[PDB]
Design a protein around this ligand. Structure first.
Ligand code: HEM
Length: 152
């Protein structure tokens, strides 16, 4: 549950991501895969990437980064009213992709990391607080659908 002020910050920060959605998406996935290599194993089309150089050079990884952040942005722009947007993602990630909620925690923190890296001194304390809350909300609503499905 975010305030309007907080949502305003979130969508303000998001404007940064939208100026370069592929570059941000790329760096988030790279930060995830290198921070937590077990996550790479969930992708049959990235599992071949051994090195970070190969990750950086991967146009298909950048492509998927675009897909992921496009979906997250659509959800964020709903300001919490994202049940229709979120339900199919929860279902596919639980039932088809089999992604534990721990990995959503991982990518949440990775987004925070990337924003500081790409915008040092331009991602203030209030901004981080708002973005973190928004990602927690997202995660918590997925977690509810996971529980429903009995998925661990
Ligand atoms: C912000 C969090 C995330 C968002 C918004 C997101 C969004 C999406 C979308 C829109 C797709 C394609 C449609 C679909 O299959 O439902 C997808 C596919 C996929 N996602 Fe996620 N995802 C997120 C996090 C993760 C994480 C943390 C993992 C694994 C560690 C993951 C694993 C996958 C895999 C394996 C696919 C299918 C890839 C393929 O073979 O095309 N996702 N995701």
């Amino acid at each position: 549950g975010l305030s309007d002020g907080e949502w305003q910050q979130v969508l303000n920060v998001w404007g940064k991501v939208e100026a370069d959605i592929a570059g941000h998406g790329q760096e988030v996935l790279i930060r995830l895969f290198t921070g937590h290599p077990e996550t790479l194993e969930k992708f049959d089309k990235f599992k071949h990437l051994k090195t970070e150089a190969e990750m950086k050079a991967s146009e298909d990884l950048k492509k998927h980064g675009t897909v992921v952040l496009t979906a997250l942005g659509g959800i964020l722009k709903k300001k919490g009213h994202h049940e229709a947007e979120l339900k199919p993602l929860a279902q596919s990630h639980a039932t088809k992709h089999k992604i534990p909620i721990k990995y959503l925690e991982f990518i949440s923190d990775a987004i925070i990391h990337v924003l500081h890296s790409k915008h040092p001194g331009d991602f203030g304390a209030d901004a981080q607080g708002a973005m973190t809350k928004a990602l927690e909300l997202f995660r918590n609503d997925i977690a509810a659908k996971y529980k429903e499905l009995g998925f661990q």
